[PDB]
Design a protein around this ligand. Structure first.
Ligand SMILES: C[C@@H](P(=O)(O)O)P(=O)(O)OP(=O)(O)OC[C@H]1O[C@@H](n2cnc3c(N)ncnc32)C[C@@H]1O
Ligand SMILES: [Mg+2]
Ligand code: NA
Ligand code: NA
Ligand code: NA
Length: 326
DNA sequence: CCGACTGCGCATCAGC
DNA sequence: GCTGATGCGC
DNA sequence: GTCGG
């Protein structure tokens, strides 16, 4: 990019603080710094210049001119040499293994992929599927396959019931040329804030996607969130496509604009936009935007009839999805 | 310097 | 079974 | 780790 070396540095520090230190506020601070610096349209020449940016304090600036000077960071050098810290970091890359689990496995001998395979019976379901597909889930999905997946999802959802609206969100909706997984926002007229008429809407769609063998495994499933695994069909004598993570959120139809704002992200965009909401006296979740009273507790949902309405409430210029990749 | 950090679904366990 | 806390993930 | 009150 432009300051790739600095933003990789903060990212790696962010990952270490989350996974090893289990310090998620340092994790988020590091991630905030990485993204504003990733915005910032000049090559950073000193830490003092960077400290001018919101979210960059003294510690990070000192690390920046340490990195700017030598092209490395001693703190990261020894984090990378700590075989324990490196092993914790590695194990968290398995879907279902987080800081706590990864740490347990290391404290009891399990440090490598090979060690996990021999110890499959200490893994919950999610972890087990995450291990089975560890190689595939490290792979990114080219927008071209995302297009086939969408075609499949939107077509099978149309088959169950023509009133379902299915919307691919995440980095796909933001125009990325590759995505990490597939995020599908589902709505249906029979499910609103004031009334759920038919239930099992989400299950109706998941079962039809498994029946046609698109969805292959389940990680978690409830009445409004499906997290699982899918796979494009391949041709005769063709290597298979990698298996892919897929998430489906069933959101009430009258709440689509907040849902689609939440599910389009990016995650950092959502965190900054929601923090600005609070500074203007509002709270945003995937469902509603609500005032904070003079007490400081949420009131009634405000009428929303477009994504732009949410931006207007907090007095932000509309940002098209392509510009929400923070 | 201080609190205060975005928001929540599903799995899981502990305490009833 | 429940509520609540924690873990993990979006 | 940072910061606005
Ligand atoms: C990183 C890309 P990728 O999948 O192409 O690699 P993404 O933007 O699609 O992110 P994803 O993890 O799929 O969550 C999908 C969206 O869910 C929302 N979200 C995810 N994590 C969130 C968080 N911690 N707080 C608030 N909102 C959050 C925005 C994501 O775009
Ligand atoms: Mg995604
Ligand atoms: Na600063
Ligand atoms: Na993980
Ligand atoms: Na996802």
């Amino acid at each position: 990019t432009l300051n790739g070396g600095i933003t990789d540095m903060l990212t790696e520090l962010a990952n270490f603080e989350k996974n090893v230190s289990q310090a998620i506020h340092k994790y988020n601070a590091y991630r905030k710094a990485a993204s504003v610096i990733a915005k910032y349209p000049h090559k950073i020449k000193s830490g003092a210049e960077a400290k001018k940016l919101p979210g960059v304090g003294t510690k990070i600036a000192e690390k920046i001119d340490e990195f700017l000077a030598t092209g490395k960071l001693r703190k990261l050098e020894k984090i990378r040499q700590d075989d324990t810290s490196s092993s914790i970091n590695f194990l968290t890359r398995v879907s279902g293994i987080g800081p706590s689990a990864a740490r347990k496995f290391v404290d009891e001998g399990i440090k490598t992929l090979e060690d996990l395979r021999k110890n499959e019976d200490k893994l919950n379901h999610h972890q087990r599927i995450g291990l089975k597909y560890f190689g595939d889930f490290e792979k990114r999905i080219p927008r071209e396959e995302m297009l086939q997946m969408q075609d499949i999802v939107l077509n099978e959802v149309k088959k169950v019931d023509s009133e379902y609206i299915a919307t691919v969100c995440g980095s796909f909706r933001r125009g990325a040329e590759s995505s990490g997984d597939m995020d599908v926002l589902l709505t249906h007229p029979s499910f609103t804030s004031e009334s759920t008429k038919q239930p099992k809407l989400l299950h109706q769609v998941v079962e039809q996607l498994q029946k046609v063998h698109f969805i292959t495994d389940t990680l978690s499933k409830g009445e409004t969130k499906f997290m699982g695994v899918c796979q494009l069909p391949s041709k005769n004598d063709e290597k298979e496509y990698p298996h892919r993570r897929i998430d489906i959120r069933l959101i009430p139809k009258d709440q689509y604009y907040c849902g689609v704002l939440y599910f389009t992200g990016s995650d950092i965009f959502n965190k900054n936009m929601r923090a600005h909401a609070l500074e203007k006296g509002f709270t945003i979740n995937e469902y509603t935007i609500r005032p904070l009273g003079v007490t400081g507790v949420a009131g009634e949902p405000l009428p929303v009839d477009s994504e732009k309405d949410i931006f207007d409430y907090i007095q932000w210029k509309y940002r098209e999805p392509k510009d929400r990749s923070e």
